[PDB]
Amino acid sequence: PKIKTVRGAAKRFKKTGKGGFKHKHANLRHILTKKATKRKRHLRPKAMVSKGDLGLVIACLPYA
Amino acid sequence: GIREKIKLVSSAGTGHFYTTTKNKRTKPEKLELKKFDPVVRQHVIYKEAKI
Amino acid sequence: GFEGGQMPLYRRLPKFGFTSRKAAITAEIRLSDLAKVEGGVVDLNTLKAANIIGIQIEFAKVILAGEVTTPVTVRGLRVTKGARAAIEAAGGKIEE
Amino acid sequence: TRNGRDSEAKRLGVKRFGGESVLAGSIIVRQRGTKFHAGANVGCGRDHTLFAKADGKVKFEVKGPKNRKFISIEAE
RNA sequence: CUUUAAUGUUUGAUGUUCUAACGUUGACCCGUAAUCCGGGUUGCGGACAGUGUCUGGUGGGUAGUUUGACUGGGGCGGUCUCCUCCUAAAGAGUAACGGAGGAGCACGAAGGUUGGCUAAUCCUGGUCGGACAUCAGGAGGUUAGUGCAAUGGCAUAAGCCAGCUUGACUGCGAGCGUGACGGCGCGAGCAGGUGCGAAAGCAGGUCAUAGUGAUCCGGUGGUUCUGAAUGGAAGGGCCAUC
RNA sequence: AAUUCCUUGUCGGGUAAGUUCCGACCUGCACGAAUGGCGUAAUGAUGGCCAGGCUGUCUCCACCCGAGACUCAGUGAAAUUGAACUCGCUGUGAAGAUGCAGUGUACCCGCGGCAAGACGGAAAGACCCCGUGAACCUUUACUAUAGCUUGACACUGAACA
RNA sequence: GUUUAUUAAAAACACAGCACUGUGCAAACACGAAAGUGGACGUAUACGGUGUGACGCCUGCCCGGUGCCGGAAGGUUAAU
RNA sequence: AGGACCGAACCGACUAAUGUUGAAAAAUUAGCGGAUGACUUGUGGCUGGGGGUGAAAGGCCAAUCAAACCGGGAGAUAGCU
RNA sequence: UUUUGUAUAAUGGGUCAGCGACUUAUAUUCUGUAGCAAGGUUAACCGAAUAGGGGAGCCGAAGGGAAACCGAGUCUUAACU
RNA sequence: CCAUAGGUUAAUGAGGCGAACCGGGGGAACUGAAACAUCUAAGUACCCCGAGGAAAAGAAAUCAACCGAGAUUCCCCCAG
């Protein structure tokens, strides 16, 4: 049959122009008062996925 | 430890806050600071409140 | 995405965003795809006739990709500056 | 209590050596205190990390009363 | 208003009676040749008992499961994240149930800036005053101090004391370092708007290195986003935060 | 002591000599009163100890009678088996050698016997550990649940305080 | 007397007797979604459960813990 | 008279030797316990698998029992060989 | 065969003959190869039935943003050197 | 007492067997989740009842979106 997308992955990655994947950064949901502004500011923009974890995300998102 | 969290809230009625800690036993009296409100884009008084 | 039972990457990271229902019923038209209509007037119903957009589509936009030769009267669609300029310089007409 | 414990290695030390050409921003030495101090075109960070403020070749030297090791720079 | 009364009033629940539901494994009559069943007559119970739906308590009576790893075999003991020194072979990194110690916080000042200042210890004299307390002088040279381990720093003090204050700002960030990745760290400089200083300037917390916890779920505030026929709203997103 | 670790406790008895037995002592590691205490005639294919009788149990075996063994005739299995031209010693070596090195010994093949070796045969160790294996058992482990109990609404009505 | 048919016959199980406890009869209890059946064509000198185990002499102290029994004033508490 | 005594049949199974690819998937020889009883035996019947039955050993339920046998789910699953 | 390592006295095989283990379907990615090329290709079904019809669809020629929205740009920010 | 239950005869009908397919009533666990209880396996296996050459479903108190479509059934897309 058809391949089924891993639906977790779908809600956390999104495909770009040259085929990479953007993702929200971890560490910004709570326990914030202590984190320094700088730390929190640098986490806010979305990030691309590293070269050694694209295999793990192309598997989960084969219709992406 | 005995070192609780608090909002400082802007006195311009944007609900912008900073959050910080305070020892409640050793200092009871309420914390009042000038800080930058980024919505109006000025420095302003900020007062204590509950987190 | 099993990493031997380390927390796997699609679960370390946050979920983000929501799916807009309005985007499923939007299109983009290229300029290259305005020769291909049969009329030289460009409604939504004229584009569906020529199999350039789908049956479910309520909105479109004409964007600047490709050239255009003739005068072509656009109607009820949106258009980007980069385009509007290139429709009108070719002799054409936009009327909302 | 017995033993069993140590921390993770903090990968301090000199990174760029004298001669080596750098770009402004480049860290030159991580360090706990000021084994080295900042001379010309060099910032003491807040953890006393020393970094280029200009492009050029790194120069070490000694200076002053106490014979302290300064990292400075020759902007090319 | 307080307190209290009979006027009327809606439900309550606590008795005591009753009989008509319901019970009868009381007696007799019939179907019938039958200790079943049913029907009748007559007693005794009687809205109780008992059965349904909902609900609290109990429930190894029964069922499904769980009950960690390292480990000079396992068990018992000990450990499991983080910081400092040594082991570590003069860059980095580097193991052992190798050798030593710490942390799971504190501080609206113990942060910022301008100005000023320089320690421990011992000796001599001096009311109560003694080995030890405030005073004076001399020697001494950081043997001191640095909120807390250790190490590296520190007089231009990063140590100590005063004045004024909130840069313990918001948006960003060339470029470096460090990680398998998640991530963690340093950062000149640009814009907005502050503080100190006459000014050059300095300030995006603390001499540095511990003081911590991914995602999911949910909560609180805000919002030019969304809103399943349309207008709202609910919910969802984004920002702040628990 | 069906209970006492120290323990062959100490003392007495029994034996030439008694870690057992019998009687005591009490220092009961850690007896004890219906998960019964202390006693008890009779009973016991029940445990321990002693004595008489009897004995090849033994000193220490000998001889004899039968059944197999052995030979001949007839019938005719089995476990096992990588291949074999299948010696000893010392050394070596995945660490206990018929098979390697060095050396010694040995004409070729049977039959009766013995069992030291072939880490002989019979069995994918039962002991130990591991598996995010299984089962069954326990409980004040977790979550349920049959059952037993509580109340509310229903079947369920009347009158009078 | 009984017992591990096929490595255990015993000091194990049973036993007469003792004690506690439940049960008023449509009994407790047991088997059955229920009807029903056993208990028993018995009725407390009877029946079920538990422990001890002829007989003789006996059977001491503790109700804090855990069960069971009783008590209802007050607290806490479900559906409704 | 007697869950009395001795002891054949009958029921059992304490000791030894043999047997251990047996004569036999539990026997044989020599001795051994009960033997009018809580005895023994024939024929037929009832109880069914988390169920039965058990003077209780986790014993027995067709040479199988801390959960029978036959078929099915089923090519269960096997980070192991 | 398994191993750091086997003549091993670790595993397995008495011998011979026969049978005995990387398959199939449907998706998806990359390479090779053929066709056509800013286009490529049809599915069910129809049908003189491996033709021809059928372009419903699918992939591509545009991306950014959570989204509205904008678009060779866009997001971030009051604003970007 | 009248009735009613009951009883006797007559006429007509059913019962059982059988591959799969179909509709309904009951309904697992192994397994996956690298443990496990929500969840999965699966409304599958199996048990039971009923019907026919087919069965079931079926002519909107249906969708749609301010334009419109016009009962059920089956195939390809929509779409992992």
Cα gap D10→D31, rounded to integer Å: 10
Cα gap D53→B44, rounded to integer Å: 35
Per the structure, the residues numbered 33 to 62 in protein chain D that have their CB within 7 angstroms of any atom of strand E are 33-35, 37, 43, 45-49, 51, 53
Give, for B50, the enclosing helix (H) or strand (E): strand B42-50
Residue C22 contacts strand I, CB under 7 A: yes
Which positions ≥6 away from A24 have C-beta within 8 Å?
A12, A46, A47, C13, C14, C15, C16
Does residue C59 contact residue C27 with C-beta atoms inside 8 Å?
Answer: yes
Can chain D be said to touch chain B, i.e. do they have 3 or more Cβ pairs within 8 angstroms? no
Show which positions of strand I are touched by protein (CB under 7 A).
Answer: 26-29, 38, 55-58, 61-73, 76, 78
Interface contact B20-A32, CB threshold 8 A: no
Task: Please report, for chain B, how many H helices and E strands are present, in that order.
Answer: 0, 4
State whether the Cα torsion C17-C22-C27-C28 is positive or negative. negative
Q: Which range marks the domain in which residue A21 is found?
A: 1-64
- The torsion region of residue C91 among left (phi > 0), alpha (psi -120 to 50) and beta comes to left
Q: What experimental approach yielded this model?
A: cryo-EM
* A32 contact B CB<8A: yes
User: Amino acid identity of A48?
Assistant: M
CA of C92 to C1' of F79 (A): 105
Residue C24 contacts strand I, CB under 7 A: no
* A37 contact B CB<8A: no
Please compute, for residue D68, the number of CA atoms within 13 A of its CA located in the half-sphere on the CB side. Answer: 13
Q: How far apart are the first and last CA of chain C?
A: 50
Write the DSSP assignment of A47-63 as a string of letters: EEPPGGGSHHHHHH-TT
At C90, give phi and psi (nearest 5°): -80, -5
Q: In DSSP terms, which residues pair with D74 in a beta bridge?
A: D57
Please compute, for residue A7, the number of CA atoms within 13 A of its CA located in the half-sphere on the CB side. Answer: 1
When computed from its CA atoms, the radius of gyration of chain D, rounded to whole angstroms, is: 15
From the CA of B50, how many Å to the nearest CA of chain A?
14
Pick from A9, A26, A46: CB nearest C10: A9
Long-range (24+ apart) CB contacts under 8 A made by C55-62 are C56/C24, C56/C25, C57/C25, C57/C26, C57/C27, C58/C25, C58/C26, C59/C25, C59/C26, C59/C27, C60/C26, C60/C27, C60/C28, C60/C29, C61/C26, C61/C27, C61/C28, C61/C29, C62/C28, C62/C29, C62/C30, C62/C31, C62/C34, C62/C87
Does residue A61 contact residue A6 with C-beta atoms inside 8 Å?
Answer: yes
Residue A28 contacts strand E, CB under 7 A: yes
Number of A–B residue contacts, CB under 8 Å: 5
User: Amino acid identity of B40?
Assistant: V
What's the domain count of chain A?
1
Write the DSSP assignment of C28-85 as a string of letters: -EESTTSTTSSSSEE-HHHHHHTTSS-TT--B-EEES-S---S--EEES-EE-HHHHH
When computed from its CA atoms, the radius of gyration of chain A, rounded to whole angstroms, is: 15
Cα gap A53→A12, rounded to integer Å: 14
Does residue B12 contact residue B40 with C-beta atoms inside 8 Å?
Answer: yes
Give me B19's structure tokens: 């959050």
Residue A47 contacts strand I, CB under 7 A: no
Interface contact A12-C14, CB threshold 8 A: yes
* B20 contact A CB<8A: yes
From the options 3.90.1150.10, 3.100.10.10, 3.40.50.720, 3.75.10.10, give the CATH code of C21-94: 3.100.10.10
Nearest 10 degrees: Cα torsion C44, C50, C52, C55? 60
Which positions ≥6 away from A44 have C-beta within 8 Å?
A25, A28
Per the structure, the residues numbered 24 to 43 in protein chain A that have their CB within 7 angstroms of any atom of strand I are none
Helix (H, G, I), strand (E, B) or coil at C88: helix
Nearest to residue A40, comparing CAs of C7, B47, B19? B19
Cα gap D27→D11, rounded to integer Å: 13
Domain ranges of chain C: 21-94
